[PDB]
Amino acid sequence: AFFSFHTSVNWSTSETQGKILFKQSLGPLLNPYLEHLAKLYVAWSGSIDVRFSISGSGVFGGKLAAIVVPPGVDPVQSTSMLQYPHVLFDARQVEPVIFSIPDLRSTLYHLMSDTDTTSLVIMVYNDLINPYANDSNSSGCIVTVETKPGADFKFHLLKPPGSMLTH
Amino acid sequence: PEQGTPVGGVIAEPSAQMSAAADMATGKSVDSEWE
Amino acid sequence: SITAPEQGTPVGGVIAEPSAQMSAAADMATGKSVDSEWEAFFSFHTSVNWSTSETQGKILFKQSLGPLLNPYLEHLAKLYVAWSGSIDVRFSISGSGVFGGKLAAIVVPPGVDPVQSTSMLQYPHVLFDARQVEPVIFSIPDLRSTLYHLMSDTDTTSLVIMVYNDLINPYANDSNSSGCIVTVETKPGADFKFHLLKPPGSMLTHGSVPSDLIPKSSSLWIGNRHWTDITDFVIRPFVFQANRHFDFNQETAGWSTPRYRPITITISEKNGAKLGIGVATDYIVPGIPDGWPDTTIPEKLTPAGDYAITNKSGNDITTAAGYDGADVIVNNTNFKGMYICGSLQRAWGDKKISNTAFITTATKVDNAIEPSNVIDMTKIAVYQDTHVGKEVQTSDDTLSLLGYTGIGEQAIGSDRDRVVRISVLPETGARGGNHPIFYKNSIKLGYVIRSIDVFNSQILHTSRQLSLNHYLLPPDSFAVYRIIDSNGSWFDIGIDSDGFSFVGVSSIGKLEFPLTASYMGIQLAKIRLASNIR
Amino acid sequence: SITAPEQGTPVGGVIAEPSAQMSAAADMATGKSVDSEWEAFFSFHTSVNWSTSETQGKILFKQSLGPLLNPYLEHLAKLYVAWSGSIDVRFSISGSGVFGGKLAAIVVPPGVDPVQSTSMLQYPHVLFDARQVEPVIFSIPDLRSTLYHLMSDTDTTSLVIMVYNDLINPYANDSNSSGCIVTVETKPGADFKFHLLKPPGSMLTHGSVPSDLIPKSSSLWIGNRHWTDITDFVIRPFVFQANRHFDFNQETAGWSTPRYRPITITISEKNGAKLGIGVATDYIVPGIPDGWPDTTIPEKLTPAGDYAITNKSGNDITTAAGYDGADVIVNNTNFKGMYICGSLQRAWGDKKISNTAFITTATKVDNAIEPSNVIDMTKIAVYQDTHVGKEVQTSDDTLSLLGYTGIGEQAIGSDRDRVVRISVLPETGARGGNHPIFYKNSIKLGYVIRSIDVFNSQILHTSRQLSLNHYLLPPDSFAVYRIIDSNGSWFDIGIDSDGFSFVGVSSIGKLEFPLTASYMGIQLAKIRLASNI
Amino acid sequence: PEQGTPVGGVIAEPSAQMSAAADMATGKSVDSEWEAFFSFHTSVNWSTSETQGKILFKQSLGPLLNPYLEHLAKLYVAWSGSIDVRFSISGSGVFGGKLAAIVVPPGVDPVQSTSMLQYPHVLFDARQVEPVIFSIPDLRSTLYHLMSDTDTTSLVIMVYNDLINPYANDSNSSGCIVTVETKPGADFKFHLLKPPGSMLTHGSVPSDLIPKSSSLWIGNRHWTDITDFVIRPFVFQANRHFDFNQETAGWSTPRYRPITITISEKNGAKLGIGVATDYIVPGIPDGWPDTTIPEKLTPAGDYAITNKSGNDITTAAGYDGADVIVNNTNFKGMYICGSLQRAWGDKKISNTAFITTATKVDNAIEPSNVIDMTKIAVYQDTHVGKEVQTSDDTLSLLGYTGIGEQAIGSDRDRVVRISVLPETGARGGNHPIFYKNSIKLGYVIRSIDVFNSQILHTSRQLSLNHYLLPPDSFAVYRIIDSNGSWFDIGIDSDGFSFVGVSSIGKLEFPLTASYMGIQLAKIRLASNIR
Ligand SMILES: [K+]
Ligand SMILES: [K+]
Ligand SMILES: [K+]
């Protein structure tokens, strides 16, 4: 019923356009409560909802993009990846933004080891700017990622406790 | 009402018939089985 | 223009035609009431003893779903690429009535591998007492992420029987132990169907299950270092071999094929030279002959003389009472660690009869040989007296391994520094808490009428199948084979992706050798390979 | 006996027959939009910069409607010859809060060319302030006197981004290098559709669009005269080259392919010559080898000796690295501007190792050689000792070019009377206030470890594409691109129908050299090309 | 709901009646027209000599059966469904012959045995009025495919009954012309639009390793065009030879450009040991040739040839008309270069160089198949006196002074390797090949052969693209000639190329290479060289 803090990543002025600050694949590790209940199961399926924001300043410009790439693909640090639907987010933007990561699977369930799932990447759309520190170049913009389970999310296949996973 | 603007910048379409396919491959039948 | 697979004008038999009265007559003569009879009865699978010595949480039975459970499906499976569906696994127990003790049943899902622990009972389990009269069936459902299974697939739903409560005899003392054996049978199940009939002469693109690595009888077991029959297993902390040792990738760090046949070479000693370097004539790797032995000499020495041994104090041994009566041997012989190799030894102008050889990988400096355990085109030593006098001869020679001159030494393959490789020596240690094993042969000696032990990483049937056939096994699992001797003492060997074999106990002991080997299934390597030694 | 494209005897797939339940299974497994997912979102196309230098009324962007405004349409355009309909646009500015200014977007109709004036804002336009975060969306309609377009058509409706209010920053009144990247994203309109499948391999009569002549990265830029990497630009009142220079008609006034390879020839001399005349063995024009250098020696000279250098009227040899700090060189060599080429002098009975070549085009009067402004089969000079006696020797040579001899000279291409042609040398001056450029790279000298500059009329990719592919451009127009360095400096190059690249500035200055190029569109050659340097 | 505020600051009004006017000027009628017709894919000559059981056509299901799907496949990473395939035989009515089509399942790899005909197969005659259409169904365990997937349903077509021409003679090699056309089935669908520039994480498809024309095939050892192939039992090479892992046991990039070095010697030393200034492996100059000399040499003088009998070759009659050739020059088996030499104060024109991997002892070099920074030998004058001379030298390889040697890459000892020598024998009934080339010689206007483990396009593509291939598989490449003789090459995961036939023979050299998918390495590669 709520979004939970998962991680936070930094975005300085050094990171040029097209760089990838984040890549994490779909799974129950995107939320602590699922990482807890994953221990009681061997399979899962379904989507995760995400909310992300930037604790930026007003003097900071730049812009940042979020791209749910499908299974199989590995991304590349190029602005050609922005030729694909993507959630723009400006550093000057205060209110967070929400979107889903669907479970696009050739199978009927996943296993906890599966890492060929749908994946999210945070990619630099426009370089971050600050007219002040042209001497230190150590500006901020913490970029938080929060997660909530999708309604289509559910675990499958209780494992016996103590039993090991083959994969 | 929780904070955040939802945005459909995706080709996502989470299908509900795939969750039933998973409940068919696995005889799920209950959300908390230990009960 | 076009004709379907069942199309053509029929004329029939020209003198007669098919009759139904005669086909009916064969059903009268027989008991043919339905086809595919194996779908109508339970077929024997195995049987386990459940004794009072076995505490709770022990696993007695463990099989994953598949067509290798029933033999009648294992046969038809050769015609199909895929399968799907459930198997029914009947259980029978005949208790004494005065006994007590309940026995659990758990159909664990796919993706897991069980453990002997009561934590497995923190999970849905059916129970049945020693006083159970009728059999119980326990259909194993096919839970699968795919739409069909292949035959190489092994991550399938499994069923385990495990001790829920210990078996109890009120009359039996704490010392004497009794038991009741539980028999297991299988039937194809109603939703079972094979899929995708394959055309014959078709490579299957992933192979099949590693079910044919160890033969089902010990009469067919011979080592990958020497051709003789196995006689016992040997547990050591590290196991290693290169020559005929093959992995599941059909690749080898050796230089020979999995077959023993003579060694044809040519050697061009110039002057009076009882030793020289031979060159390959038959080979898979350039430079090295196929069948060349994978062991060096201990020391630098000049082969020039005769045999010699002593009983630790200069007392030479010339009789069996001295050899067997000795505790250790010095072996002052000048051609110690080599192989006798009969040596036809033909050439043009060498009318003298041939003389045996002595071979190893070693260097050569004008009279001698030094131990070099890295085989090359120049590490092919021979000492056979090819009657040379001050002229190049270039004799052709064929050699057949017979014996080993290294009297008094330890078993062959026990020292890596003496074992030969090209660049990389395959080697393992204890995976999980499961110890590796050598397979033990014996090889003839020089003039003593005894023999010396010989260690082997594989059985040659295991090497042969892994050179030709393609198998799937991740680097974390084992292909398990349950060994059963004549008395019933059993243990499980597990073969590696690397090709090495393991065992789940520190010592096997002695055991009847007319023994067998049955494929139980794939098993993760952490889990201790089960055993019952007695 | 007649069969149509969808006609035949259907037998099926013998072992099974296509199931619809599996195709419906795959739709739910993957989600689904209606058969063209690219029609549903905005895709990154380009980004343009807006500094404080750009005054009010300046135009930062002009690109005409077409399928090049979206990558997915540029892909499927290759399967068609016609199109029609609108494109949706979303644009934004990655500005700061401290930045002011304001920017405007104007869909001008067909026919009109815009002007850098605020009078263009007397027309409906989308205002966008630098302080504005949420993007803004609007359509570019297809307003056409025809019923369909062709891929070459550039008289379509067009968009321009125009400075409405100058950008402001109270901080940097010393550097004046502020930012505000301005991105443009595109989506197809619902009225968009392609027409008229072309057969694959078939060419278009009206040509394609010149959008691939320069690569998108400077790592791939090499010269049409020497194979080294471009390093900077040069502006001159006249720009000329013939050898590997190709116009838009796939025509070159020179003699060589757009490649760099060894040069095979066959000398034949006698009595002790060292200065023979070769003959071609690989060519496109009869007589001249493919890849022969397009430059002639300064004057008449009798190659006999070795290198000789000296400073300003001083008779002081530059034996050391005091070559530098001299600023003038006499270059007293008897070989004084030839090209150095490693040779493989193969002959029958020579029995001696080969020697370097020292080639050029010139007229062999005697041992001497006179500068030939024009090339011919009777001009192909080579100065090397092939070890000749009295009898003829007909060696095979197979040269490969390594360096240059004209130490202390201007860059190869400055002087014109030394640059070689066949008959007519292509040349271009200023064309509407825009200045032509060379592409400058380097070539190694023979004696001093330093290198000398070399001028080029094109990038070799521009020559390979114009040698092979068929493009449209009216003579009164450019195929305009925008060059952007790692900093925020940029300038638009314009490639004319003759193959020459122009520039609007008089001096480009130094630039962080990892550069990129993007196709903006077709412009007239009269209006000056935009810049910020 | 997508981001952005729409604003009608326009006089635009996109009219919908103009899109219908365009559908009237052009008979559009369908958004994806390629689904409505069959498109040419290939053609095979079915001859009177090809016997029963020989496969004419074999292709697994996928987008590569149709160009329009091959074009749209670049925008996606998944597909699913059937593709139709049409056949038109086009022979005379005096001909009598019959083919058989086999749709084999997803999970087997067929062979050229008649055991494929122990399985449901449809027969169809040479003398057909109307062409025949086969739909290849997408049988699968998954719910969709990826573009890297190759275990799919296939269609095999072989000769059930040999083709007959009653008017046949030794001078009449007539037959039928079987054209294959494809159309995507009604159930074909692409899925999973990809981001551009993104690479599949497990690998792409080896569809581009051999170019489609021999006009631009060049070797990975010498820059000259291939001429024909060579079959040998053991093929091996390190430099410029890349596997399917973007890895290399060599030291130079998959290209050809000059070799810059510096040589510092003194006391009139014509020998030297150069040091790199453009490397990828620390020490070696990134382009140094991978072959040594046969023997110890003291390079002093000039060329020298005989013919086993102390004669001397000074004309193009003895060289060609010699029993054998004996190279008695003190610089033999090394590489001729252009060698522009620069040094401050060297008022002397550059002399050509002679380079090879070898040690040095004060006047003489000895061969060493190993290479490091201590083996980079040169032989140039350099015009050095008593003191050191840094001599910035740049080399361009043009020839080879090993007149009498057999071929470069034939002797494993002469071939250079850092530590490891990539090497393969046969795998199945399939033999490994070299790609043969030619390099020029020093004193003679003739040439010598050169062996290459790869075409250079095969090397650079593997240098910078991660493809997918199991170890027990090939990437097959059908290679036809101007006449009609053809054979399949199979590239191994190690980067080596194999062939099924034992001898190739003569070939009209305007060749073209296609791609015929994946094939298990334990299966004979096809051949119709005759
Ligand atoms: K003999
Ligand atoms: K010569
Ligand atoms: K020099």
From TrEMBL, chain A:
Residue ranges crossing the lipid bilayer per the database entry: none
Source taxon at top rank: Viruses
Subcellular location: Host cytoplasm; Virion
Segments forming a coiled coil: none
Protein family (similarity comment): Belongs to the caliciviridae capsid protein family.
Name of protein: Capsid protein VP1
Source species taxonomy: Viruses, Riboviria, Orthornavirae, Pisuviricota, Pisoniviricetes
Residues of the full protein shown: 168 to 334 of 668
From TrEMBL, chain B:
Location relative to the cell: Host cytoplasm; Virion
Family, as annotated: Belongs to the caliciviridae capsid protein family.
Name of the featured protein: Capsid protein VP1
Portion of the full sequence shown: 133 to 167 of 668
